Structures are given as structure tokens and as C-alpha cells.
Amino acid sequence: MKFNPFVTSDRSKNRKRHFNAPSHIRRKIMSSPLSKELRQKYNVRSMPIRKDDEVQVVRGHYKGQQIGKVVQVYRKKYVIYIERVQREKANGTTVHVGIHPSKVVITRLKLDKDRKKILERKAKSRQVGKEKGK
Amino acid sequence: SELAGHQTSAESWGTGRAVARIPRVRGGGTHRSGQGAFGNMCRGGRMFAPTKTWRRWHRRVNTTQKRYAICSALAASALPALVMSKGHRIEEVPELPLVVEDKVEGYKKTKEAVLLLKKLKAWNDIKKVYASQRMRAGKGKMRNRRRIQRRGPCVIYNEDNGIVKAFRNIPGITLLNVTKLNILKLAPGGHVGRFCIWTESAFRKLDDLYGTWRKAASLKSNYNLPMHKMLNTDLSRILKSPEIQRALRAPRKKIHRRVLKKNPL
RNA sequence: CGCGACCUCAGAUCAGACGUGGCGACCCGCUGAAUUUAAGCAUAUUAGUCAGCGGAGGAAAAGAAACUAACCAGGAUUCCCUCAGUAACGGCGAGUGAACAGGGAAGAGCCCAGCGCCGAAUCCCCGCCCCGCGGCGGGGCGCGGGAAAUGUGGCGUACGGAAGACCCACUCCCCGGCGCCGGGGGGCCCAAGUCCUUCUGAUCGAGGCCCAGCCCGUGGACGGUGUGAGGCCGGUAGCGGCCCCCGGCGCGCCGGGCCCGGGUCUUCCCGGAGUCGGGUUGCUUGGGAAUGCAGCCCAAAGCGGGUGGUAAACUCCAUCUAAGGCUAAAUACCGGCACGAGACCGAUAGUCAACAAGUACCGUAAGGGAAAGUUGAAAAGAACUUUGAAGAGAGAGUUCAAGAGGGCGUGAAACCGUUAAGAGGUAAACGGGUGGGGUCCGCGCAGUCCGCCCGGAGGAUUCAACCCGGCGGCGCGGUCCGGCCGUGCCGGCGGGGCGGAUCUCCCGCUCCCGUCGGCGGGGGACCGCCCCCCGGCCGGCGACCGGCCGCCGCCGGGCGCAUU
RNA sequence: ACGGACCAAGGAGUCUAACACGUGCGCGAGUCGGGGGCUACGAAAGCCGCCGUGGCGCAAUGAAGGUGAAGGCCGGCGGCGCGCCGCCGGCCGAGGUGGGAUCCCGAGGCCUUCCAGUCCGCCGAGGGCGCACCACCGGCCCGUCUCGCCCGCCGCGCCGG
RNA sequence: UGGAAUGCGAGUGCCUAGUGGGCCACUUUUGGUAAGCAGAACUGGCGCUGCGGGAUGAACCGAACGCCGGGUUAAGGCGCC
RNA sequence: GCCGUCGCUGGCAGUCGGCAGAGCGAGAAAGAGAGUGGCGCGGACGCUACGCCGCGACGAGUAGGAGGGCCGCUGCGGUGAGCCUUGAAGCCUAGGGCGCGGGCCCGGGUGGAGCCGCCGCAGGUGCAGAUCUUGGUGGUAGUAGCAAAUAUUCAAACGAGAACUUUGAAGGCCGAAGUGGAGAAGGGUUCCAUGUGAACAGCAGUUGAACAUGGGUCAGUCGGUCCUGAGAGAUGGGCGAGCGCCGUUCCGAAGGGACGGGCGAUGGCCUCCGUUGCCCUCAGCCGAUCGAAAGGGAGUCGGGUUCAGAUCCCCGAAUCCG
RNA sequence: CGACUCUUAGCGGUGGAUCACUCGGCUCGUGCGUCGAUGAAGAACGCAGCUAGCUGCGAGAAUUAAUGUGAAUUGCAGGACACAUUGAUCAUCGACACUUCGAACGCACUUGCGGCCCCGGGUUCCUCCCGGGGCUACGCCUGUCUGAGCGUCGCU
Ligand SMILES: [Mg+2]
Ligand SMILES: [Mg+2]
Ligand SMILES: [Mg+2]
Ligand SMILES: [Mg+2]
Ligand SMILES: [Mg+2]
Ligand SMILES: [Mg+2]
Ligand SMILES: [Mg+2]
Ligand SMILES: [Mg+2]
Ligand SMILES: [Mg+2]
Ligand SMILES: [Mg+2]
Ligand SMILES: [Mg+2]
Ligand SMILES: [Mg+2]
Ligand SMILES: [Mg+2]
Ligand SMILES: [Mg+2]
Ligand SMILES: [Mg+2]
Ligand SMILES: [Mg+2]
Ligand SMILES: [Mg+2]
Ligand SMILES: [Mg+2]
Ligand SMILES: [Mg+2]
Ligand SMILES: [Mg+2]
Ligand SMILES: [Mg+2]
Ligand SMILES: [Mg+2]
Ligand SMILES: [Mg+2]
Ligand SMILES: [Mg+2]
Ligand SMILES: [Mg+2]
Ligand SMILES: [Mg+2]
Ligand SMILES: [Mg+2]
Ligand SMILES: [Mg+2]
Ligand SMILES: [Mg+2]
Ligand SMILES: [Mg+2]
Ligand SMILES: [Mg+2]
Ligand SMILES: [Mg+2]
Ligand SMILES: [Mg+2]
Ligand SMILES: [Mg+2]
Ligand SMILES: [Mg+2]
Ligand SMILES: [Mg+2]
Ligand SMILES: [Mg+2]
Ligand SMILES: [Mg+2]
Ligand SMILES: [Mg+2]
Ligand SMILES: [Mg+2]
Ligand SMILES: [Mg+2]
Ligand SMILES: [Mg+2]
Ligand SMILES: [Mg+2]
Ligand SMILES: [Mg+2]
Ligand SMILES: [Mg+2]
Ligand SMILES: [Mg+2]
Ligand SMILES: [Mg+2]
Ligand SMILES: [Mg+2]
Ligand SMILES: [Mg+2]
Ligand SMILES: [Mg+2]
Ligand SMILES: [Mg+2]
Ligand SMILES: [Mg+2]
Ligand SMILES: [Mg+2]
Ligand SMILES: [Mg+2]
Ligand SMILES: [Mg+2]
Ligand SMILES: [Mg+2]
Ligand SMILES: [Mg+2]
Ligand SMILES: [Mg+2]
Ligand SMILES: [Mg+2]
Ligand SMILES: [Mg+2]
Ligand SMILES: [Mg+2]
Ligand SMILES: [Mg+2]
Ligand SMILES: [Mg+2]
Ligand SMILES: [Mg+2]
Ligand SMILES: [Mg+2]
Ligand SMILES: [Mg+2]
Ligand SMILES: [Mg+2]
Ligand SMILES: [Mg+2]
Ligand SMILES: [Mg+2]
Ligand SMILES: [Mg+2]
Ligand SMILES: [Mg+2]
Ligand SMILES: [Mg+2]
Ligand SMILES: [Mg+2]
Ligand SMILES: [Mg+2]
Ligand SMILES: [Mg+2]
């Protein structure tokens, strides 16, 4: 149950703030769980998805064990495009099929200075909570 | 809104133009011109008797009657038949009323609360709240009321030392402070017989809060329990007693059905 | 004549400032109807309301009595409850209509002119130096300028005030700089299943996840994601974490300002004028021989003046102190900024406006003012072949579905085409009664099921009767033991809580002499009720039970092995 | 005689206030906290009691000043002359008549082999206490009228009863 | 000997809607030449009411009404319709 | 016979069982009374008492009243371990039924995501009408009609397609108060080139002022610009609660200018002249301002040139003002 | 026969009811409670590579700077020697900027006429021309300067 007086649980307000979210907020909304190996390694559960990440599709027609590179994060449409997750049009040209980030698992992360900073911050806040309970 | 239907300068054409005499929108050059207006039979008009914010939404209930209602709810909460007839799965609860030691007032983790309900055999009631969780039919979904579920046990405590935070995440559970009991919580829907779990300290304050028959309430300035109109409700035992039985005439249980009339001639 | 002061008045693109317009929900000042009611209508009502004009602020206005009262008196203003639909007004008709007291919200009090004393002790601006400098100020220095005796500043204002004398008591209070130590806004982050089967176009669905109970839970709000999700993502929870900025509260240094009070006596001083008040006129009010306001005329007093709800004279009383000024809070808020919620509506509804809506469009203008939501999970939005000038078609293909094909979810009625069946010269339709024919249904077509009994064929986790154990019911066990227990009754050196408009050794203040009486605060006793302790009767355990004993029933296991 | 060509959707006794009566619930000569205060759902609910101010009810009547809701018997004395009035002490005491649901008593009576006489019940002429309610008759309180004789005193009155 | 017959259970109180245009007939009856005219009394109707008969018809005659079977009737009928 | 209403304010707690004993409907009060002396283990249903059962009578209805609805609609508290992608709502149906009825159930189809029962609460809760509102659709009806102003015809071309377009040729009309050539007001891109032939152009179109893609307006001299006209309109002033209004020379210190002269200051082609400050001298205009693309108002003509502009561009020849 | 007509049903149309959805309303509550001559509200015209409307912005014009964020924006193209302490994008927003009218301000309201000061280019010291910049509205307060009067006077 929610008790914060300044947080709305209104359905219309929560959908409007999802579908009008600005680009830097859609990034956070567009987050994917990490693999079991990555989750153990970094102590992080989810990361915002990024171009050049390698993911597994775990839901839908294209689910399986195939790992593909993230080739486009279409934040406007709330989907990512993944290598080999595609189909053909009538004229035979191949077109990418959009997958929501919540339906993939990140197997390899595209690491740079800022990404290593974000992983570190997430892992530290987690440990503060674990010691708080302990 | 008090303006709905009235933000126009519509005027009746009057008779003679072969149309009904409803006030009509003025001007021209748009679909709206010459259409009906204002009246409650018109599209875009004003409704009949527009609702007002000074409808009397609130009701006064006498204190003596509200306390009467809290007493009936508690009396009906200690009878297995009424609690079972309220839908609560109390077929294995050791006793009714269910009183648990005061340690439970100091629980902190939700897992302790769950385990206690399992050893008190109040977990079947919770599992029935999980089975009743579903979506609500109608516009309520559009109005922040999408999920419906049945009420579970009510836990009544004397002092809160983590018990509220322990129990509040278990669906169907309602916490109540014994000194601030609510009929809306003790008789949900207006039906008596909600399953209540009592802490020992909460159970011991009841006499003070509502008074016995001999002793007036100590925590209410002037109040005592409502008196009974019938001291022995066991109608069967009254009727089968020798005193009543000796005063009766013998029953007449022979049926005298209609007699077909045969012509004597 | 000239020169120079002052006064009154001019011009400056003079130096530096300030006002204008907007918005207007709430607020203040004006002005101000008529629909309407009176079953007509003129007073009245509507209504001090709509419209009109001016002026504001985060609130405004009001406000520290020329008050209420008539009490044993209260004590600024505003608001809430009540007073009260009352006193009163009113073609005394329709209708209208307050206040005081009482209970609350809030609570805060002050300052001039005057009368006086102080050598104008006062103020503004320019120039230079130090400090600060996006709220333009602090200090220092100018034989710098001006204002101001046609009156600035300090003391002081009705609760009295001042000066002097005598007793008593005094060192912290503020201004401008500088340094150090402990709510608000923003940013980032923090639990747990995408586990095994399985349904599906896809699923968040169903089933399961050892004892024990998949895992987390201070988090099972909500949203998203190809259903329907606490555990997939964002979130949610948490006196959770980290990082910025702003503020508030504290402590020291520097340079300034103040040189500060109480009581008792002595002597002095003390107030707002074309205003009050009166006449009259008009408006206004519940205010009635006139409540408030305004115009004109008259026009004050100083033990006076005003009020004292019926005009006036006389006379006592009570109560204030007008004609100058400031003041937070409690109160209001359909505008604005930012939020939260709902027993509301759900695209002819709800705002006119769910959408390129105050838009398109109409009017010279003031103004008037709509219609209009939905493919799909995903555009995968139909390549290619073929007829046609093309629109359109036929195939093909995508999709779970185009029997979803770009104004595409579903897809009603009216109305229309076609197919099928029936029928047809008193328009059609209609009630009742049959008959014929259809469409489909009985998932019909040798026709029910059940108890007991007789007989023939079989087969057994085989019957009764006894034995062991468990459980249950009942018992007037004619009167067994133990319990709890009486919204029962009696006896107590019983250990206590509540109440009393029942009575009465300790102390605080205070009148009188160190005495002695009163107000207030406290024991104690007594009375009623209740709780807990112990003894005696009766008494329940059918809203309230255990052990033994007896009877009965049931179950499990033995034995009975077959005319059952 | 008027409206109605046809189909869909919309479309008209509502809400606030006041009053009256009926009904249901709570408490009851009381009752009501509504305003105020205290202590996610919750703007809820709980509480106040030296917060019951206050409303309504518990008293009416008169324009008002005002007044404001049973008596009798016994004994004693004073005055008038057995009866009356005034003042003193003791006893009883909220009226009566008719009707009146219900309740109470009970003349007599409710069978089995025949008599006596019991316990529990049961019916019943007649007789009683009489609810509510109605009719009638008395009484009491306030306004007003007529008649009339007394009683009180810090105020001896154009006094008060 | 509840003091004529016959029949029938009565009394009482609150609140209350619609109505407040009527019209027709036997008999009586006013005005009028009269009127399917205007205006009264009494009772009954229609209004509010179908049903059998008067071919048809607000009021005439019979009779009043739940959904049925059988029987019998009223007023009216029985050449054919 | 059946249904309902009313009445009997009728009957049933007695289902009192092997701790047993079955009855109380019958013309005519009150006990199936209690006592004291003289083998089998068995026996239907019932009773949501707001239930169940019996007997008798009755049944018209506008206006109007009342009752009961397990009639229907939307939402709220409870409950149904309710339903549902193995298919919700909605919709359709010569399918099977239930109910006096309001209505409801089930079958089949379509549909694609939510919905309902019961106890209570609440209401913007039930349509045939209102010359009702809004939207849609009929018959009329392939009907009225596409008739004002004399008129067309031949050949060819493009083209899928020609009565209507283009070219040529005939026959006609307007008949210089034009159906010609140019402007003002108004329009605002309609102008010009190319393309289209969906919609529109009340037949058609190969065409258009439609649609689409791109272009096109050149000035000292032609207008505006300036003047004043009838008039409008600030200031001073007056009035006015006030936004403001009256008024335009009227209650006004209404000139910011000048030939010249005298005092200075600055500069430069520094010789002496400019500029500049002050003083002297001189000074009616007497009403700010707006007001005309037809009035007043200097000065441009010839030729050529484009798809569309030209007294504007280019060539030539001029001219006014400063 | 067969048309036509009527009824019912299948299918197909016309139509957009119903149902389910809701980034919209409506109502209540809370906190704050801030416009302008430093030029507001409002209006006009512009601004994008392809851009009509809406939206946003103002010749620095679908935005500059800064801070946070941390790899996009996206309908297509493109990538400035755009791309990770050489920072995409979004957000915040304190710096800078902000055309014309409008209280609207030189006078007028036609993009009409000026005046003063300074600067630059023609020219060549002044002039003259062109361009740029700054000023030039009403009221009103304090002060300043320059004045006026047969106003009151003083000395001459
Ligand atoms: Mg509306
Ligand atoms: Mg629904
Ligand atoms: Mg100046
Ligand atoms: Mg009237
Ligand atoms: Mg009237
Ligand atoms: Mg009238
Ligand atoms: Mg009047
Ligand atoms: Mg008035
Ligand atoms: Mg107004
Ligand atoms: Mg105004
Ligand atoms: Mg203003
Ligand atoms: Mg403001
Ligand atoms: Mg005042
Ligand atoms: Mg006060
Ligand atoms: Mg009253
Ligand atoms: Mg009034
Ligand atoms: Mg008061
Ligand atoms: Mg207070
Ligand atoms: Mg003074
Ligand atoms: Mg005072
Ligand atoms: Mg998570
Ligand atoms: Mg599962
Ligand atoms: Mg979820
Ligand atoms: Mg979801
Ligand atoms: Mg789960
Ligand atoms: Mg989280
Ligand atoms: Mg948090
Ligand atoms: Mg004063
Ligand atoms: Mg007036
Ligand atoms: Mg008046
Ligand atoms: Mg008087
Ligand atoms: Mg003030
Ligand atoms: Mg719509
Ligand atoms: Mg609408
Ligand atoms: Mg519609
Ligand atoms: Mg709808
Ligand atoms: Mg609409
Ligand atoms: Mg739709
Ligand atoms: Mg489909
Ligand atoms: Mg579809
Ligand atoms: Mg869809
Ligand atoms: Mg649709
Ligand atoms: Mg469709
Ligand atoms: Mg058909
Ligand atoms: Mg046929
Ligand atoms: Mg009519
Ligand atoms: Mg008609
Ligand atoms: Mg009542
Ligand atoms: Mg709330
Ligand atoms: Mg007549
Ligand atoms: Mg009638
Ligand atoms: Mg009748
Ligand atoms: Mg009849
Ligand atoms: Mg005849
Ligand atoms: Mg018959
Ligand atoms: Mg005949
Ligand atoms: Mg009837
Ligand atoms: Mg059909
Ligand atoms: Mg869908
Ligand atoms: Mg509603
Ligand atoms: Mg309807
Ligand atoms: Mg309709
Ligand atoms: Mg024709
Ligand atoms: Mg011409
Ligand atoms: Mg021409
Ligand atoms: Mg055509
Ligand atoms: Mg053309
Ligand atoms: Mg003027
Ligand atoms: Mg001009
Ligand atoms: Mg001209
Ligand atoms: Mg030339
Ligand atoms: Mg553009
Ligand atoms: Mg930037
Ligand atoms: Mg950046
Ligand atoms: Mg002009």
C-alpha cells in the first residue's frame, strides 16, 4: 500500500505520465533485468537498456536462447530493435520487430565510464539496505 | 457545472415557423445554429434538476445507537454460526473469541504475522481472500476501483508496537485499536459476524470500554450495556417446558377437507 | 532708476524618482434596475441584487469604545454556534428582520496633534575616505548645498502625563559588517520467479514448487509490458542512503547608538470646529415623533460633549470621551501556479471544447460558434501475376482474424438488393379456433426406474455372538469426586475503586492584635454501588466441564470360515 | 377535432429548506454535540461531561404591570347568634358517576364396579378490583366581571393578601 | 318473558388524492311556436363499462366482467343471409 | 376445475418413540386425571413459523390512492474459494422452454475482454407521442425538372473515349449608349506556364476562374506621401462619483525663432573665416493634430522588349526639385 | 408460365446504435498566492534541410549559455574534420538574448514627417549625402538652474 500523499495512484494520471514521459525518463522506464550471471557479478538487478547491449528475448514469438546486439533504442515507441529479431515485408525487404525492454534479459553490458558509475551506485545502495535489515 | 447547458444565447423562434417552440441557437453558418437548447430533452442542453453540491451527503447517528451497534457486532462475533455465515473459514480455529498473547503486539516482520495466522488456523481465511481477488465489473475500473476482494480477519490490539506494520501487507487483514472500534470495520456491509483476533490486552479493556451489566463503563463517561428484551431466547425450551405444556388445549391436527355434496334425493 | 531679500507663480530633453495598463474567484468605495411576488397593481417585494464606474492585497476591510449594559456587571476587531425567523418593520398584506447577553476560533496592542522642556537637539542631497555592495546601506570628513521657528527631532497621549525631592535598584538592549556549529527545492539510487509442466497469435492464464509454508513483504498502491502480474520494468515501503543549493536557529570579533528604571510625596499640564448639535429634504435601516448616510440652512460648549431604542421640560444617576492615526491572528477565495481525491459522466454524456476548439464557419460590427475518439500484439498497411484508360476487379500473400484493408473494434434498427419458401381481385395489419406445409428439436423409433420377496446359477476385504482398544450420547451416579461459577442469599477485625447538595485533623492567602476570624487547597469518618479475598446454604454448567462408575451406540483390530 | 412518414439514441415530480401527520430505532423527564476541542481506506471512526453553552421538552396565562396549577375531619379558642367566619395544634388524603378489554373470588359442576374423602388441574350463575378510552359532574391555575367580609405589617398605604 | 317484523358485527381517530365544464331517460316541471333548445325535482344511468338483444348507435331492453368445461336462461328471436 | 383477493384476526412447536404407546370433529361447559381407605430394535413427509395447511365467499373500472414484484437499469458496502481467451460484454437467431405479466433461462452463430447471482445501500433508473432534441433512412421518384436573351454545320488532329477541346472552312450574332478596348470600389493570386482529369464546374469534357507543381507586379517624373474641405480631435479651462465628457480660441506667461550688433569659447583650406554660448535688438498670426488613390499639388516622352511587368525594364531623347 | 406485391428466413448492402475502452471533463480538498514604462496582458508578422496547422521560439528565432543527466533524435535525409572531463538527448533554468503594435512614449498611425548629440563611409575643415547608435510623451515629488510681478518690503 502507498501512503505518500504526493504520489498519485490515479490510473489516468499514471498513464498520461507514461505516454508523455520525456526522453530522459523513458530511458529509466526502458529498463531490462540482467542475466543471472550479470546479476551475481555486479549485485544489480536491472539496468536501463542501451545501444550495443546483448540480450535474450524471453517473451513473444522471437523468444529463445539466441543473443543479439541491441541496434536501436526507439524511446518514442518504447521498443528496442535487436539483431536477427526481424521479419520480411510484402516486397521482401527485412524489417526489425520492436521488443519491449522488459521482455528481454541483458547477457552482456556495453560498459563505459558512465555505465560503470551507474552500476556502482546501484550496488552500493543495495548493500546499505542489506545492512539496514541485518 | 452550474453553467452546463446555459452558455448560449438561444431564443425561441415562436410559433408560426412550423417547428417546436424549444429555444433555438442564434446566428448562422455552423451546424449549431437553429438547434434546440437549454431544455433537458435537447442534445447539449441542461439536465433536469442539475445536481447540487449541497445535497445532504452526511447523516447524524445517535451515540447510544452507534455504541449499540458496536455491542451487537461484538456479540455476533463470538458465535461460530454467525462468523461462519459471514464466510470466514474458522472450522479449525481453536476457540471463539480468539485471544492471543500480547507478544503479537510487538511483531515487526510480515513473516511473523503470517506464521501466527497459520498456527492459529486463521490462514485458510487469508487464502480465501486471495481466491476472491479479481477485477470489478463496471465503471469502477475507470474510477480507481479495479480490484475487489473479500474481507479477512480483523486483528484487534491494545497498543501498536509494530503489529500494524507487521500485518498491513497481508491481504484482507484489518487492524483495529480496541479503544477506537469501528462498526464499518466490525460489520462490513452491514452484516454482523466478522472474524476477529484479539490480543490479551485488548480483550481485557472491553469491560472498561463498554461496562458490564453491574458496572458502568469506566472509559466512557456515562454508558452501560443495552438491556435485553428477551432473557431466554431459546424458544424451543420455553415451549417444551412443563409449565407452558400444562396450560394448553390438546392440538387439533386432523384435516377436515371439503365434502363433496351428494344429492340425497 | 539700480541692487538685494521674501512671497506668489512660471519654463527647462535640468539631477534623481514615482503613477498610468492588465487580471479580477475572493475584497473596499460608489452608482443601481426590471423581470418577479403580492393570484390585478402604484407602497412594498425582487434588492442594495443584476448591469455600470473606480481602487486594492495575498488576503482585503475592520479594530483597541464618544461600546454594551442596568448585572454581584462586562470590556478592541473579525469569524463559528446560539440568540432567532425572535424584538421590530410591513397596502401590519405579500413579505422582511437585527442586536446584547452566553459557548467557542483567534488573541496584541499602540502612535500623533495639542499642553510643555530641551541652544533645531531634526531631516534631505552632494563631494572625498573605509566597509558592504543584484533590497544602495553603516561609519568618518567637508566655514559643502537645501529643508525646517508659517515648527523637525527626543520625552509624553487620557490606562493619565511631566519636573523636583527622598528612598530603592541598575548593565543588557539594539544597528552595520565579519567569522564558526547544529526545514524547503533539486538530482541519483535501494526486495522478491520471467522456476517446472501446460493453454495461447502472444500471454501477466491454469497446475506445481519436501517437513512447511516457491521467494520478498516496514514494499499485495498504481502504471507499463502481445490476457488477467506483489516478484519482468518503473514504481510502492522505510526515523532508507548519497550528492548539490536555499533557509532557519545558535556562538564569537569589529565599528557604532543608549546612557536608560521603580515607589511615596511636592508642584504643575491636560486635548482634534463650518465639527458636534439642531431644522428641513432625499435616500437607507428591524430601528418604529425618524437606524445610518448625504445635500442646503442654522451653528456650539467646556464640572462640557455623546449614549442611555417614544416626542418634550425638570431632576438624579450610569457609561464613554467624537470630529487625527497604525495594527498581526482566527475569516473569504468558481481567477492564477502546483498538487491529491471521488458511491460523479463516459464521446448526443461530461466543460462549448477527450481530436490542428474558442478552432472551422456566420455576421459590417457588438457578437454567435459546431461537427469530429477506436485497424492491429506488432504495419507485418497486401510484393508479384493478370483484365481495364482508370477507378475498380480476379488470383497471391500478411495476420489468430481483413468475416480487422488506412473515417478500418464491435456493427443494431429503419431502408435496400439478392436467394429460398409460401401466398396474392374486397388496402394491409389484427383477436379466437382449427387445419395444411416448413424449419429445426426429441442429439426419438420395440420403451421406465426403484424397495422387498420367490426361484436358478455363481463369487467372497463374510454374518451374528464374544475379546482388545478408541470415540461419542445419556445418567433422577435414586444423593460419586474435582472444577469454574451464580446479572443468588447469609457471616467477615476482610483488601481496594467509583460516586455523594452526608458530616468533620493539616496547610496557602488575607482582616485585627504576636493573637483571632474568613476564602481556597487537603485527611478522616459515614452512606450507596462495584472489584478481589475467605467461611455456610441453595444453584447452573442447554450461550458456561474434566476424572472415575454404569447403560447404550459407532469405529478399528482379533475370533468366528458358513443352512449365516 | 389536434399531434404522429419511418428507425435509433436522449427526453419530463428532482434536490435544499420549513412544516404536519404516519411508521421504524435509541434513550426517556429528559434528550440531542450538530459548533468546538482531544486522539491508503481516513474528509472516516473513537472520545469529551466543570465542553450541555444552547435547542426542544418539563407551565400556563395576560396588551401589560404581573400572577402562575386539590381538600376534608378531629380538638381548642375569638367573634356573630345549633349554624357561620378567623386563628391555632393532631389524623386521612389527588375527586366522583356510567361504560369498560383483562384480572380476581366462586353457588354449583367436570363419570367408569360401588361408597367416603383428598391433591392437582378444568367450566361456570353471581359477585369484586377496574387499564386505555369516551360521555358527564366536581375541583385547581391565569384574564375579566358582580357581590362582600376579613387578614398582614420595618414602610399603615391611592399598601399587600 | 332484552317487551313488533326482517336483515346485518359495530364504534372511533388521524392523514389524504382527484373532482368542483357534465350529459341522458321514466315520471313531475318553468320559459319558449318549437328545438337533438334553455332551466329545475326524484330516481336510475352514461361519464368510468365491457357483454346478449334493438341491422348500425354513449344513455334503450336484458345483464354487469377472474381463466375454463357442461347445463339452463333473460331481453330478443327461429324463410335465406 | 384452476388462479388470485378477502374472511375465518382459522389449524400446526405434538417430529411429545422401546426413558414408546400414536386419540381430543364432536349435537349440547369442565380430566383419554393422581393416588388413600372401605423372538425382532422398527415406525413416510413435515416446520425457509416472513413457513406450511384447511374451510367459505368474492373478482367491472377512468380520475385517484395503496400493496407486492425471485420485474428491469447504473454505481457503492458485503458475500458467492462466483463466471471468463477451453472465450466476458454486446449483437443476431423459422432452436428448446419458464412466468398472468413486467421479464428471464438455455441452445446455435458472430464477438474479442471483461461480467454476473444473493443480502443491503444509492440514484441523472424504465418512452409512442410533446408541430419533442440530435443523427440516419424512406415513399413520393428515375418523378418536377435541366425552355429568358435568333444558331449552328463540315473536315482533320490529339486521345481509351469527342454534340461540347484545338486548327481550318462555312452560316450567324453583339453592331461603337457593344457581347469591343481600359480603369475606380471590392476580390486577393482568381494572373502566367506545365500537368491531372479523383472531387467540383446541376449533360460531358481531351476543357476550367477546379486540383497539383512552379513563376509573375521593378518609378525623382503614374499615385500615395503634402494641403486644406465638410468635419474630426488633444492641451488651457470647465463640468464630472467616475471610466470620462464639453469645448477648439473659448477663463492661457500659448514665440524656443531671426536680419543685425556687442561680449567671449573653440576649431579649419589657421591668412581670417565658420561653428558655438550669452546679452541687446526685432517678431501678430490667434491655434496641436488629423481629414480627399475623383478637389489643390513642380517635373517623362518616343521606340523595343516578356509566358505573364512595364510612361517603372533596355535603347534614345528630356525635364523638376534639392 | 412470368412480372409485380406481401410475409418470414440466409447472405449482401446502407447506417452508425450498442458494448467494451478513456492522455478528457466535472465536483471536493490541500499548499502557494507571483503582472507592468527594467515596457505587462493582448495582438501582428516572422523563424525548421524538407513544415500547412497545432506547438515552441524572436533576426542568437522548433532556440544560445550554464547545471544535471548520460547515448540518442527519428517521417526521410545529413553529420559540419556533430559524438563520452572535444558529452548525443532530454530535463532544469540562475546567465545572455528577446522583431512590430499595444498603458505605448518625438509628432502621426501611411510601414508618412521630424529635431538634438555622437560615430563610420563618400570629400576635402565646415556644409551636403548615406548608414549606425543615443535621446526627444503625459502627469507628478524632492532638489537645481533660468525667470516674472504697479505682491511685501530694505538699501539706494
Ligand atoms: Mg450536456
Ligand atoms: Mg456493463
Ligand atoms: Mg531629467
Ligand atoms: Mg402581480
Ligand atoms: Mg399571476
Ligand atoms: Mg402584470
Ligand atoms: Mg416598488
Ligand atoms: Mg432594499
Ligand atoms: Mg455588478
Ligand atoms: Mg474597472
Ligand atoms: Mg489599477
Ligand atoms: Mg498582486
Ligand atoms: Mg476607528
Ligand atoms: Mg471583541
Ligand atoms: Mg426557538
Ligand atoms: Mg430588504
Ligand atoms: Mg456576544
Ligand atoms: Mg480560545
Ligand atoms: Mg507636540
Ligand atoms: Mg482611549
Ligand atoms: Mg523490482
Ligand atoms: Mg502460475
Ligand atoms: Mg501489475
Ligand atoms: Mg497489466
Ligand atoms: Mg504468484
Ligand atoms: Mg524498487
Ligand atoms: Mg521512498
Ligand atoms: Mg480622538
Ligand atoms: Mg435608492
Ligand atoms: Mg427600505
Ligand atoms: Mg425614554
Ligand atoms: Mg486600518
Ligand atoms: Mg462523438
Ligand atoms: Mg460533447
Ligand atoms: Mg453519435
Ligand atoms: Mg453511448
Ligand atoms: Mg459531438
Ligand atoms: Mg463506436
Ligand atoms: Mg474476427
Ligand atoms: Mg474485427
Ligand atoms: Mg485494438
Ligand atoms: Mg467504428
Ligand atoms: Mg468494422
Ligand atoms: Mg432479405
Ligand atoms: Mg417467390
Ligand atoms: Mg387544440
Ligand atoms: Mg401532421
Ligand atoms: Mg415520529
Ligand atoms: Mg480521503
Ligand atoms: Mg336540458
Ligand atoms: Mg371526464
Ligand atoms: Mg359507478
Ligand atoms: Mg353498462
Ligand atoms: Mg333499428
Ligand atoms: Mg356456457
Ligand atoms: Mg335476426
Ligand atoms: Mg378489479
Ligand atoms: Mg426475426
Ligand atoms: Mg483488444
Ligand atoms: Mg448517475
Ligand atoms: Mg430511450
Ligand atoms: Mg424514442
Ligand atoms: Mg422528365
Ligand atoms: Mg470592359
Ligand atoms: Mg482587358
Ligand atoms: Mg457534370
Ligand atoms: Mg487562366
Ligand atoms: Mg472632445
Ligand atoms: Mg494630412
Ligand atoms: Mg490627393
Ligand atoms: Mg528614366
Ligand atoms: Mg513555414
Ligand atoms: Mg545548450
Ligand atoms: Mg548537456
Ligand atoms: Mg493620409
Residue numbers in the entry:
A (entry chain Y): 1 to 134
B (entry chain C): 55 to 319
Paper text:
Alongside a RhoTM2-bound map, image classification yielded a map in which Sec61 is bound to a different and unexpected density. This density consists of a kinked TMD bound to the Sec61 lateral gate and a ribosome-binding domain (RBD). The resolution of the RBD density was sufficient for de novo modelling, identifying the sequence as RAMP4. RAMP4’s RBD is connected by a flexible linker to the kinked TMD. The cytoplasmic half of the RAMP4 TMD is hydrophobic and binds the open Sec61 gate as if it were a TMD or SP. Bound here, RAMP4 holds the Sec61 pore ring wide, just as SPs and TMDs do. Unlike an SP or TMD, however, RAMP4 does not displace the plug helix. Instead, the plug moves together with the widening pore ring, keeping it plugged. At its midpoint, the TMD of RAMP4 is kinked 40° at a conserved glycine, and the lumenal half of the TMD is amphipathic. The TMD’s hydrophilic face is oriented towards the channel interior and completes the hydrophilic lumenal funnel of Sec61α.
